[PDB]
Design a protein around this ligand. Structure first.
Ligand SMILES: O=C1C2=C(CCN(Cc3cccc(F)c3)C2)N2CCCN=C2N1Cc1ccc(C(F)(F)F)cc1
Ligand SMILES: O=C1C2=C(CCN(Cc3cccc(F)c3)C2)N2CCCN=C2N1Cc1ccc(C(F)(F)F)cc1
Ligand SMILES: O=C1C2=C(CCN(Cc3cccc(F)c3)C2)N2CCCN=C2N1Cc1ccc(C(F)(F)F)cc1
Ligand SMILES: O=C1C2=C(CCN(Cc3cccc(F)c3)C2)N2CCCN=C2N1Cc1ccc(C(F)(F)F)cc1
Ligand SMILES: O=C1C2=C(CCN(Cc3cccc(F)c3)C2)N2CCCN=C2N1Cc1ccc(C(F)(F)F)cc1
Ligand SMILES: O=C1C2=C(CCN(Cc3cccc(F)c3)C2)N2CCCN=C2N1Cc1ccc(C(F)(F)F)cc1
Ligand SMILES: O=C1C2=C(CCN(Cc3cccc(F)c3)C2)N2CCCN=C2N1Cc1ccc(C(F)(F)F)cc1
Ligand SMILES: O=C1C2=C(CCN(Cc3cccc(F)c3)C2)N2CCCN=C2N1Cc1ccc(C(F)(F)F)cc1
Ligand SMILES: O=C1C2=C(CCN(Cc3cccc(F)c3)C2)N2CCCN=C2N1Cc1ccc(C(F)(F)F)cc1
Ligand SMILES: [Br-]
Ligand SMILES: [Br-]
Ligand SMILES: [Br-]
Ligand SMILES: [Br-]
Ligand SMILES: [Br-]
Ligand SMILES: [Br-]
Ligand SMILES: [Br-]
Ligand SMILES: [Br-]
Ligand SMILES: [Br-]
Ligand SMILES: [Br-]
Ligand SMILES: [Br-]
Lengths: 183, 184, 183, 184, 185, 184, 184, 185, 184
């Protein structure tokens, strides 16, 4: 299944201070990722942490749970985009420590405003819609914070799905370095 | 298996007596039929009263408002009659009858509530969808306040949840005018 | 129950008053029936006006444009009437009535939006399908600008997302000319 | 639901005007109805022109070729009219109208492409099935070149993928002769 | 949803007045019954005036087709077969069972002949019985095709082991039909 | 896909730190485990605090109250922490932490609402079923009022519909005590 | 059940030989596992060559491009071996092996073809997805041209439809370097 | 649910210690990977000691089978093939690709060979490409069967046009296996 | 769920006693497990008898014939024991035990019948499929006559339909040798 090395390969990735946030994001991934982060901080709260991101997005609450944990812990977090980073995946990618957010050369990065659904009486529709616009402003604020772009530019760029290449994402402020090979 | 009476079907004879049936759920198909019946009876006579029998659980708001607009357009006096139950858009159509000519049989049930709906898509689309349903709420409440002569406030308070009324209670509320066991 | 009226079913009697019903979703079957009704009423009189009652949520785009092309082809003036709601292709048919004879009942709803679609298959096929959906987007916009007399810029702005309008707002936009509550 | 006019149904009245409708997907059932209408209209008169209204997304090729062969068989001029859309077998029947009498309303879409199909079973059966549809590709390309006056090369280049055209783009390709906003 | 013409019939009953029977679409026991009633009726109005069968079928149930076949041969009238669009499986059989010299096809039709298919399930005795039945069937149909094509059983066995698709002109050479018709006489 | 740490699994390692995870919907299994974990931690120490990480959209009400009753029973200080989301019974357990030790991360969402349910069967059964859901409404309202220090009237008004709060709003309402953007 | 050979399961034993298996469809789950093995083998030695056995019909393009970016990143020579078949993303990883070290067993099949996808929603969204698919096609076309040394016209021409190759044909095209019937 | 024997393994890992690899059951990419790892491992423990393949398969994915085939020919060891119960489609190919003179079958097994099947959908260009591929495949496998059976392609083309079922003794005459084994040496 | 006894699982302990279980439907997977157990027990000792417990409703014939050929291949005496039921391929394996060492518990049911199958496709394919299963009928009848010492005629008469037997009725037919209530 998962290969054993010398002790399974994924626990071996955890010893190198590497956390994988690959695949769709839900509360289960949040629980696992958060527990990995808190663990690495207890072994060393100063030695950097590497988060390998290859995700299409996922549940918004779950991602913001991972986000708050990245910002909470004292370690530098190195984010690395592998394959794809879309929706909340690009949020985790951008929340890496400044100057420590990376991408491999052929990745794709995409940002967009949240989606949702509301059913029920008009009052319930009214409440549910207030919540989705509060969410839209919340995620927008976070992107502007870590991209150092105006909230204004974020609003324009995220109204629809905006796809970027590693270099386009660097200029936009999503990542800092595009790496074809080890330094 | 619609019965034929003496050479008509029972419903075509009912249209001949100037009687329109609004029974069952209301959708555009029901609207289309009822609208055509009303416009036809008005061409025969724009003075002779028209009778509507309502036994509906409600249905699509636009379709109901199409019937509502048609009731208001035609010049005839319209007699509404609640049979069994009149809920949602049914209670609106019932109350939209000509003043003094809105009726109910003794064991009927009447129900009003705010509209319901659904929104899907991006947050931008949700905002748009949600704006429309609050506008519909203000539209239907305004119509109800008009024909009950009640305050918009009472309207809101009552329609926030499902409020079931008895024929007798709906007469106090302003939905109908008369509760009838036998003809006068 | 289609009622029988005095020897006529209620819908054939409506056709005798020169009234054509476009209620419900629009598909090739609806386009077929409406087109046949228009050509017939033009054969009884190529001058006497025809009345189109609209209560539609939209539907198949080609079918709608088939009806639109017929309204413009026949020589009669066509009076359109929105009852209940006329949205998407319904509002186009509403606006395609002859100027000054486009009406609405007081509590109707009118809505306009850009077309939606789907593409599947190889990258080359996706290119072709999207070029087609864009051409349709320009096609419907040009038709909408024509009958509302609104600038193509306003139409582009107004139809990027869904626009719900009241009878009066629609009059202002140029979709209809008259709002009525009584004869 | 078809309206009744005087006294027949509106589609039978349209056949009275020498109008055949080819709307909707094309299968052997439409072929029966279309073929029977054409052969009948010829017995009424082998010279009075016949009008075909096309609003079709395509369909079964043999059924379409059945109509094509019948269009060619009868002696009458055939006026084709594209309304809404004519794609796949529809654009063939549209283009097969009598030269100079092939029409389209201004906002139609016209589309041409090579046939699609499917094969299953042993390799030997697949080989047969693959030969049979290359034969159709050569057949439909030939018919299109014949009536468009285009070269087979052009047909081959144009029909390798879905090629969507505007009414005037098809007039230019040889698919129709006239684009009409209003009656001449 | 059938148009009504001219004393006023539906277009299909008007076709029957012209002595034209449609065997268009798939063949099942319902189509067999309808075609058989139409054949017996037209010989009843005239047992000599030719009868026309319009064929545009992909095949269907074998017994149903052999039921139509047996009636065609039974009635006294000449039967003119016309392939329109397509005639495959039993459809080509009915096409070829027309009276000699009066079997026609429009220019772009397709003709296809093939051996029968079937299925067997159950105990072995049963499987055996069923396969024997299918063999006897292949043989029957092969013999019919030979009789009407005038081809030897050897050519038929070779030609129908797999799906054999033909053009009208190929069908005329093979012996399934006699005339191909580009425009009227 | 659970990693191993030095040698336990990360989740048994969290129990090693006296940290209990209440993530996901709350059902009877979750409750079982959480209760066991809490009791174990009490066994290991009657004084050292216990930490609950709450990231839940709600779930079965009895199940949630089973966890609640356990929190109040055990003597340990209980630190509650909202991560991601704490809604329905999740917000109840969050507010049920020991006073002064209830926390939330900056971008969490908190939501409170009255219970929902269902009734089917005879009128007598509906009456009985409906009496119980009003009893939970009063029970859950009382619990919330206790730990938020809000009057029962303010709770009743706020929980009639879904009430969403941010961490700060929740601090003001009385659900949590501190909003942490980083360690102290 | 995967056998134990000594104590190792045979797949961990293959990782011991610096052999990574890329068999089956490629998705994000394979990508993590493939990437973790590649990164691990480089830490055992950034010089001892790594062998990838490829028997894949393709899969998600981004997931495959994740493996590709990793192959180019690490410093080791990577030996690619086509076993059975390498189609779609499989032939790209295959062609991305270290120059001079890309292999295939005698009876394998190789296929290269342009990416496929889907777009749904408003025309505005359709444009975005259609632009994204065009960039993917140009991106993968560039990658194939880099490692096959073929000009971009030849790639566009060869990948417009499904292009199937034999080991000797793929060797000529530039996808692999050696076809082996036996060890040397 | 595998029994554990004798330092204590499961019965299947104990079979691998005897240099016996099972290709029993249908063949897919998973079976190909498992068999390939087992072959490469046993040549690694000994590249000379013979390897035994137990075959009881109804066939499966063609590429997967040709993947196992290519490995059998690649490794240096003699491979002894043993047909147990049944070997049909690719299963008989793996059976016949054993090293000459070491291809065996138990007395009541069945061997069946047949041409490949497949499917094609889409536009015509695509159908064409796909059928070409299937043809090239028939040819490939036909060539393999000839090489290991020593039969001419003409005999193979004739023999595999339809499902050809054989007895062990018939398979020995045809050239698929060398020895039939009633009881041990 | 299998109990653990000393220390192994109860089925591995049963293999220690030289007991192979053939319970449940027989397919190629049971054949692998049964065949591997027999070949393994022979390497432990080619003379110590082996016991097969049969409680089976039949199954795939080739899988059953795989076990039959292996039973014959090994040198050991095989004691067959019918427990519960042995029908279709089960009664063959039961009767194929070493002469004089084939047993049944008192209340078992034993059944023999001719094989069943299925054929689909062109007539020519049906002919092949029908030949193949008449070959199995002749094969299984022969094996049954061999071990029952019955004539093929009797086998043919008995197996044309389902023939159910009691333990003593099978001893008499040649299917087993001993019916045992209690240990001798
Ligand atoms: O970090 C903490 C935290 C707390 C309580 C606060 N909470 C804040 C928090 C909560 C949820 C998500 C976050 F992002 C942050 C952080 N407590 C309390 C118990 C003793 N320790 C700790 N620790 C060290 C610790 C943790 C886990 C492991 C583990 F790896 F073993 F699981 C080892 C050491
Ligand atoms: O009874 C009425 C009734 C009205 C209007 C009041 N409504 C009250 C009502 C409604 C529903 C249930 C009830 F218990 C009572 C009774 N009107 C008005 C039109 C002329 N006539 C009538 N009649 C006689 C009549 C009816 C039907 C036919 C017909 F179905 F045969 F056509 C002929 C004559
Ligand atoms: O009422 C009208 C109306 C129009 C055009 C306006 N439109 C306004 C309207 C539209 C939709 C819903 C409404 F609420 C109001 C009313 N026109 C125009 C043609 C001649 N007549 C009419 N009439 C009389 C008429 C109707 C129907 C029958 C029939 F039922 F017998 F068919 C006979 C006579
Ligand atoms: O309008 C025409 C048209 C044609 C030829 C097509 N051309 C073009 C056209 C325009 C717009 C939409 C279309 F789809 C097609 C219109 N032709 C030719 C045969 C005689 N008449 C006509 N007419 C009169 C006519 C129609 C129908 C009925 C009936 F429905 F009552 F039967 C009576 C009279
Ligand atoms: O055109 C023919 C045809 C034949 C036999 C040949 N066949 C050839 C053909 C051509 C194209 C497509 C086909 F599928 C078949 C044409 N025959 C024979 C019986 C008398 N008439 C005719 N007619 C006139 C006719 C038809 C039908 C109606 C009716 F449907 F209105 F009844 C009236 C008159
Ligand atoms: O055979 C090889 C092969 C390579 C690379 C080439 N490749 C080509 C090949 C041939 C046939 C089928 C295939 F799919 C691939 C064969 N390499 C490279 C790493 C060191 N060794 C090897 N070996 C020995 C080896 C294998 C496996 C085990 C183990 F299973 F025990 F781990 C030990 C030793
Ligand atoms: O390669 C790295 C890499 C990093 C961080 C950068 N990242 C770049 C990268 C990321 C994703 C895909 C790529 F293609 C490339 C590569 N770091 C940081 C932690 C210490 N080590 C490493 N190493 C050696 C290492 C890795 C994993 C194991 C494991 F086997 F334990 F999992 C052992 C040794
Ligand atoms: O009872 C037997 C029996 C046999 C031969 C079968 N005969 C007949 C039988 C009776 C009742 C139900 C049956 F299904 C079968 C019973 N044989 C032969 C091999 C050595 N031993 C035995 N034993 C002792 C034995 C069993 C099992 C365990 C174990 F489960 F612990 F492994 C230990 C010892
Ligand atoms: O019986 C054999 C057999 C062979 C090769 C022939 N084959 C013929 C055969 C007969 C019946 C059914 C079959 F499917 C195959 C029998 N070989 C070759 C490798 C060394 N040994 C053996 N043995 C002893 C042996 C087996 C297995 C275990 C183990 F499973 F416990 F590991 C230990 C000892
Ligand atoms: Br999102
Ligand atoms: Br409502
Ligand atoms: Br639209
Ligand atoms: Br013509
Ligand atoms: Br086509
Ligand atoms: Br057939
Ligand atoms: Br709740
Ligand atoms: Br691809
Ligand atoms: Br095969
Ligand atoms: Br033996
Ligand atoms: Br059996």
């Amino acid at each position: 299944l998962i290969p054993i090395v010398v002790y399974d390969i994924y626990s071996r990735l955890l010893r190198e201070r590497i956390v994988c946030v690959m695949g769709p994001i839900d509360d289960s991934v949040a629980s696992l990722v958060i527990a990995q982060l808190l663990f690495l901080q207890s072994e060393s709260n100063k030695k950097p942490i590497h988060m390998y991101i290859n995700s299409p997005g996922g549940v918004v609450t779950a991602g913001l749970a991972i986000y708050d944990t990245m910002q909470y812990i004292l370690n530098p977090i190195c984010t690395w985009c592998v394959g794809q980073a879309a929706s909340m995946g690009s949020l985790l990618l951008a929340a890496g420590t400044p100057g420590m957010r990376h991408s491999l050369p052929n990745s794709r990065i995409m940002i967009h405003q949240p989606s949702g659904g509301a059913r029920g009486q008009a009052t319930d529709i009214a409440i549910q819609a207030e919540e989705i616009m509060k969410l839209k402003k919340q995620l927008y604020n976070i992107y502007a914070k870590h991209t150092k772009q105006s909230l204004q530019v974020i609003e324009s760029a995220m109204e629809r799905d905006r796809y970027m290449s590693p270099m386009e994402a660097q200029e936009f402020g999503i990542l800092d370095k595009v790496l074809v090979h080890p330094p």
